[PDB]
Amino acid sequence: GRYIGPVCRLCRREGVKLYLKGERCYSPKCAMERRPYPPGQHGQKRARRPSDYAVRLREKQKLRRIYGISERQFRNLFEEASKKKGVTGSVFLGLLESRLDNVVYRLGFAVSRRQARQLVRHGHITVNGRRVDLPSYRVRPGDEIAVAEKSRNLELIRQNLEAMKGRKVGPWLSLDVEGMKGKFLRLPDREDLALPVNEQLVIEFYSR
Amino acid sequence: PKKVLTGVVVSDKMQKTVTVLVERQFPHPLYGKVIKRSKKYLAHDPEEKYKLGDVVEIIESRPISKRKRFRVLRLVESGRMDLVEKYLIRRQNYQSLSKRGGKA
Amino acid sequence: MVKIRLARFGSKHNPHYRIVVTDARRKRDGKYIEKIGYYDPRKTTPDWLKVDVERARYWLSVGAQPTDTARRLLRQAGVFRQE
RNA sequence: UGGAGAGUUUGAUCCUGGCUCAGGGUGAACGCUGGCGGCGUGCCUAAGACAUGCAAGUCGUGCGGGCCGCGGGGUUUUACUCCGUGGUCAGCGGCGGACGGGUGAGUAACGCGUGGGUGACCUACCCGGAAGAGGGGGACAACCCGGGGAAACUCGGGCUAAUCCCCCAUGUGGACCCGCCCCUUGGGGUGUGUCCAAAGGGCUUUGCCCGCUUCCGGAUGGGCCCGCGUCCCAUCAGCUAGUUGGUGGGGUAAUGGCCCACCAAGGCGACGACGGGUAGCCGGUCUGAGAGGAUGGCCGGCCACAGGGGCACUGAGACACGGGCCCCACUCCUACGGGAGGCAGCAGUUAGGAAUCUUCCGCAAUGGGCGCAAGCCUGACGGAGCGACGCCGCUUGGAGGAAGAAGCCCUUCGGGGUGUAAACUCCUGAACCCGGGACGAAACCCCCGACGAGGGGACUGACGGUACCGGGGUAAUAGCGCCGGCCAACUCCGUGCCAGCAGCCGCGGUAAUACGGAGGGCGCGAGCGUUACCCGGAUUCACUGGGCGUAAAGGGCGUGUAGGCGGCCUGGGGCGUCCCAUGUGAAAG
Ligand SMILES: [Mg+2]
Ligand SMILES: [Mg+2]
Ligand SMILES: [Mg+2]
Ligand SMILES: [Mg+2]
Ligand SMILES: [Mg+2]
Ligand SMILES: [Mg+2]
Ligand SMILES: [Mg+2]
Ligand SMILES: [Mg+2]
Ligand SMILES: [Mg+2]
Ligand SMILES: [Mg+2]
Ligand SMILES: [Mg+2]
Ligand SMILES: [Mg+2]
Ligand SMILES: [Mg+2]
Ligand SMILES: [Mg+2]
Ligand SMILES: [Mg+2]
Ligand SMILES: [Mg+2]
Ligand SMILES: [Mg+2]
Ligand SMILES: [Mg+2]
Ligand SMILES: [Mg+2]
Ligand SMILES: [Mg+2]
Ligand SMILES: [Mg+2]
Ligand SMILES: [Mg+2]
Ligand SMILES: [Mg+2]
Ligand SMILES: [Mg+2]
Ligand SMILES: [Mg+2]
Ligand SMILES: [Mg+2]
Ligand SMILES: [Mg+2]
Ligand SMILES: [Mg+2]
Ligand SMILES: [Mg+2]
Ligand SMILES: [Mg+2]
Ligand SMILES: [Mg+2]
Ligand SMILES: [Mg+2]
Ligand SMILES: [Mg+2]
Ligand SMILES: [Mg+2]
Ligand SMILES: [Mg+2]
Ligand SMILES: [Mg+2]
Ligand SMILES: [Mg+2]
Ligand SMILES: [Mg+2]
Ligand SMILES: [Mg+2]
Ligand SMILES: [Mg+2]
Ligand SMILES: [Mg+2]
Ligand SMILES: [Mg+2]
Ligand SMILES: [Mg+2]
Ligand SMILES: [Mg+2]
Ligand SMILES: [Mg+2]
Ligand SMILES: [Mg+2]
Ligand SMILES: [Mg+2]
Ligand SMILES: [Mg+2]
Ligand SMILES: [Mg+2]
Ligand SMILES: [Mg+2]
Ligand SMILES: [Mg+2]
Ligand SMILES: [Mg+2]
Ligand SMILES: [Mg+2]
Ligand SMILES: [Mg+2]
Ligand SMILES: [Mg+2]
Ligand SMILES: [Mg+2]
Ligand SMILES: [Mg+2]
Ligand SMILES: [Mg+2]
Ligand SMILES: [Mg+2]
Ligand SMILES: [Mg+2]
Ligand SMILES: [Mg+2]
Ligand SMILES: [Mg+2]
Ligand SMILES: [Mg+2]
Ligand SMILES: [Mg+2]
Ligand SMILES: [Mg+2]
Ligand SMILES: [Mg+2]
Ligand SMILES: [Mg+2]
Ligand SMILES: [Mg+2]
Ligand SMILES: [Mg+2]
Ligand SMILES: [Mg+2]
Ligand SMILES: [Mg+2]
Ligand SMILES: [Zn+2]
């Protein structure tokens, strides 16, 4: 994926599990277990009252870190969203969620987003029956996201779709565990997501 | 359409030519207030038919000389040196504002 | 004299001509007198050639001389067809 | 649908007020770092100088020749001489060289923008329409002969063709003078008089094609004029005598002091003349809530310039970047007499500079010139090259993995941190290998058909064996800035007003979260910082949106000129103002 480096050290710094590793992020080993405090020599030091600014800086980091997106891309998406019609907060979340690499995570083909990102890159994914190896690729209502017919027998893809059997998926989505096909029914709504982020602080972060 | 302007004849001391002082009004591009700006046109008069104080219409014309690209169309109303006076005084007032002394 | 020719408007390796009426002396991509169509050589979309025969005919009737490729296209759209 | 503020003057406070930071932007440059690709973009300085190659030609269907062939005739044979055909060379003649490409030096201007005017005009080639091309004559190159020069080349003598020059004719028509009429600044008509046309060529030859002439018109391109708009200094206030106007003339496609002779005495200026500084203008671009500020690279339009200055010739068009003449500076050749040159075309060199690229591939595509066509020419252009210079996409892995290795590290010595990070397990599989392999190209052309409409056929790819598709396949670059406050991030040690930081506040004179290192941390990541510069915040020139008792700011007072401003009622006009319609507002953005 992106960033490349200790990931659980970010959950630590955000003091909120940003579930991004699949297993472990459930088992008593997410570091957020018996180690909730942030990383570094001063992790357990009595934290000082954060500054109005620090607060918005961390909220924007928590969000962007969840999708594993660069600030360059995050910002470009936010600006696009800003000028667009409709509550910038939701539209922004709507867009982040429309990234192919994300839709793959959402459909369970991958246990995490970094994995989903690698699956898309290595050509194991297909949009509308055509190979699309762009994590930033924007899915649109009606698109069918499937597993590449030649990758349908990958040891990883099996166990991952096996686990999706009986398992429910986002209301704005829908998948057929059999044909390993997914469907982007519609852009998710604020209420559809359960993100540990007050995106209002993010809009504010970009007006400073 | 050949521009038609209306002004006052301030100069007459010319052969087959009269000077027409034309004014115009317009809002200041930045400050709004309506301001009056003026301009003198040397208009053609083949018959030396117009004199000082004559308010005449001037029409855009084929060059008659350097400076002369307008001809006197018609007379709008005559005699009225009140208009010529402003010009004259304003002209004489130029004596005071300079480096040399002047009973302006 | 005035011509009916193609003006280049795509991008590198992505040519998209614009069938225009211009004086023979202008840059091929300079100021034309009128656009009367367009043409995508690679036919990337079903609509890779529009012409407006009406207009093509007005200019032809007043002098406009089309290049060879220009008429090839104008004809393909029935500018000269009289059936 | 659009507007965030912060630090810093005091012991403390409020205010005033400047400085400074957070944001965005750039033809960038510099430092450390640096993997792939697409698309853009790259001398901003000395408009300094330029080696070399290339950057405009093309027509044998306009003409006659020279040189080098091949072949056929006249003849009993030679000499001699006639014809046909191929190549080649320039010449005459024509169309193009006034476009395309470059640069912004100059210019503060009708230069540009915008809206209009031309009864004051032009427009090659293209399109439509009308009429026509009968006869005669001439010369100059080529070539041949001779002369002067080192060369550049130049002088003379002789011959010759034409779509070259001239004469006579026809006069559709058109031009001019005078008159009349309609219009009304030189528009249109008409009458007499005068004046003016032409070119030939080719065959799928006794017609058809290419072309010629005069005229009316179309289309396109352009000249000239006018209103309005277009930077700083008033420590620049007076300026002007071709100056301002008139008459006549010259000139031009055309108006005009455009130019000239003569006459008048004018014209311009504080609503900023003249003078000085700076500057190509615009569509737009950047910024800004907006108003506005700044700007004009790339692309598109206009202008201007082609070593500096002047000038005109030829042309439909030039006062002409790769045409001509002269003066000047300079380089070069020189037999010193005298000559040859001008990359602000592409590429490249050299100089200057903090700094800006390949002496590349192709004319396959689009566009241009010339040709009936074949086709030739196109450093326009289409492409590839170099540079993180900009934008976008992408990679350096994915999942599992200890209450947690080693080292480093802090330690109240018990532990704490780096760290699921690593190792390691498994999975995928950037690179790279093999295979296939494009779109961009269908026209011109030729056949059928009328050299038309329409139908049919063939040739043609620089990029490129590149994109893309399929098979195989390795875990496989990370950096830079920062952590006193503003401003997200703290500890040890070294140092001791030193060494040094420092955008502004300010740090350092022995326990320094501010120097240097280290661990750790924050931020961003193929980049990150720095310097410079523009807009913002800065209502810090305030039109929106500020002020002047004591903060900077009321003129020492008055009189009064221009100018600004102006009581109540009615009426006309309708300039300002408002409304409707309509035209314009190129494309790109
Ligand atoms: Mg595979
Ligand atoms: Mg702001
Ligand atoms: Mg302040
Ligand atoms: Mg004080
Ligand atoms: Mg203090
Ligand atoms: Mg380097
Ligand atoms: Mg490039
Ligand atoms: Mg330059
Ligand atoms: Mg040379
Ligand atoms: Mg060449
Ligand atoms: Mg023989
Ligand atoms: Mg020849
Ligand atoms: Mg040009
Ligand atoms: Mg000046
Ligand atoms: Mg002019
Ligand atoms: Mg006109
Ligand atoms: Mg015209
Ligand atoms: Mg004709
Ligand atoms: Mg003859
Ligand atoms: Mg001879
Ligand atoms: Mg000789
Ligand atoms: Mg002779
Ligand atoms: Mg003869
Ligand atoms: Mg005759
Ligand atoms: Mg006649
Ligand atoms: Mg008349
Ligand atoms: Mg007449
Ligand atoms: Mg007549
Ligand atoms: Mg013939
Ligand atoms: Mg005087
Ligand atoms: Mg005169
Ligand atoms: Mg004349
Ligand atoms: Mg005189
Ligand atoms: Mg001046
Ligand atoms: Mg300049
Ligand atoms: Mg804007
Ligand atoms: Mg403002
Ligand atoms: Mg603006
Ligand atoms: Mg502007
Ligand atoms: Mg430039
Ligand atoms: Mg341009
Ligand atoms: Mg011009
Ligand atoms: Mg030079
Ligand atoms: Mg001439
Ligand atoms: Mg040159
Ligand atoms: Mg140097
Ligand atoms: Mg070509
Ligand atoms: Mg061509
Ligand atoms: Mg891992
Ligand atoms: Mg060809
Ligand atoms: Mg036939
Ligand atoms: Mg055909
Ligand atoms: Mg690895
Ligand atoms: Mg600091
Ligand atoms: Mg802080
Ligand atoms: Mg020391
Ligand atoms: Mg110390
Ligand atoms: Mg101390
Ligand atoms: Mg420290
Ligand atoms: Mg301001
Ligand atoms: Mg104030
Ligand atoms: Mg005071
Ligand atoms: Mg007082
Ligand atoms: Mg005083
Ligand atoms: Mg009143
Ligand atoms: Mg008044
Ligand atoms: Mg009234
Ligand atoms: Mg009115
Ligand atoms: Mg209007
Ligand atoms: Mg319109
Ligand atoms: Mg537009
Ligand atoms: Zn976690």
Q: Name the residue ranges covered by the structural domains of chain B.
A: 1-104
CATH number of the domain that residue A23 is part of: 1.10.1050.10
C33 CA to D218 C1' distance (Å): 16
For residue A1, which nucleotide's C1' is closest to its Cα?
A: D397
Residue linked to tokens 């360059």: A72
Mark whether A88 and A105 lie in a shared domain.
Answer: no
For residue C33, which nucleotide's C1' is closest to its Cα?
A: D586
Domain ranges, residue A53: 1-96+194-208
Mark whether A16 and A69 lie in a shared domain.
Answer: yes
Question: Mind spelling out the 3-state secondary structure of chain B?
Answer: CCCEEEEEEEECCCCCEEEEEEEEEEECCCCCCEEEEEEEEEEECCCCCCCCCCEEEEEECCCCCCCCCEEEEEEEECCCHHHHHHHHHHHHHHHCCCCCCCCC
* Contacting residues 20-49/C vs strand D (CB within 7 A): 23-31, 33, 41-43
Mark whether A65 and A17 lie in a shared domain.
Answer: yes
| CA dist., res. A70 & res. A4, Å (int) | 12
Q: In this structure, which amino acid lies at residue A141? A: P
Mark whether A139 and A204 lie in a shared domain.
Answer: no
Mark whether A145 and A73 lie in a shared domain.
Answer: no
SS3 C22: strand
Q: In this structure, which amino acid lies at residue A100? A: L
> DSSP states of A103-139 as a string?
HHHHTTSSSSHHHHHHHHHTT-EEETTEE---TT-B-
For residue B59, which nucleotide's C1' is closest to its Cα?
A: D226
Domain ranges, residue C76: 1-83
How, if at all, do strands A175-176 and B70-77 pair? unpaired
Q: In this structure, which amino acid lies at residue A29? A: K
What's the CA dihedral at A6, A12, A16, A21 to 10 degrees? 20
Q: Work out if B66's Cβ lies within 7 angstroms of strand D.
A: yes
CATH number of the domain that residue C30 is part of: 3.30.1320.10
Mark whether A59 and A140 lie in a shared domain.
Answer: no
Q: In this structure, which amino acid lies at residue A93? A: L
The neighbours of chain C, by the rule of 3 or more Cβ pairs under 8 Å, are none
Tokens of A1: 């994926």
Q: How many domains does chain A have?
A: 2
Task: Report the DSSP beta bridge partners of residue B58.
Answer: B5, B72
For residue A44, which nucleotide's C1' is closest to its Cα?
A: D416
Mark whether A65 and A105 lie in a shared domain.
Answer: no
* Cα C27 to middle of ligand 9, angstroms: 29
Q: How many other C-beta atoms are found inside a 10 Å radius of the C-beta of residue A9?
A: 14
* Cα B71 to middle of ligand 15, angstroms: 21
Residue A74 makes CB contacts below 8 A (sequence gap 6+) with A60, A63, A64, A67
Helices A52-67 and A71-83 sit at what angle, rounded to 10 degrees? 100
Method for structure elucidation: X-ray
Domain B1-104 fold is OB fold (Dihydrolipoamide Acetyltransferase, E2P) (2.40.50)
Mark whether A9 and A91 lie in a shared domain.
Answer: yes
Mark whether A177 and A199 lie in a shared domain.
Answer: no
Binding residues of A for Zn(2+): 8, 11, 25, 30
Across the beta sheet with A144-147, what order do the strands follow?
A: A130-131, A125-127, A144-147, A181-183, A175-176
CB distance A159 to A65 below 8 Å? no
The distance between the two most distant Cα atoms of chain A, rounded to a whole number of Å, is: 54
Q: What's the Rg (C-alpha) of chain C? A: 12
Chain D positions with any atom < 7 A from a protein CB: 1-4, 22-23, 38-40, 99-101, 115-120, 124-127, 185, 218-221, 224-230, 237-238, 244-247, 255-258, 264-271, 292, 299-302, 365-369, 380-384, 392-404, 409-410, 416-421, 426-430, 439-444, 452-454, 463, 469-471, 475, 486-491, 519-526, 543, 561-565, 575-577, 586
Q: Work out if C5's Cβ lies within 7 angstroms of strand D.
A: yes
CATH number of the domain that residue A182 is part of: 3.10.290.10
Q: How many other C-beta atoms are found inside a 10 Å radius of the C-beta of residue A151?
A: 18
Strand runs labelled E in chain A: 125-127, 130-131, 144-147, 175-176, 181-183
Q: In this structure, which amino acid lies at residue A88? A: T
Q: How many domains does chain C have?
A: 1
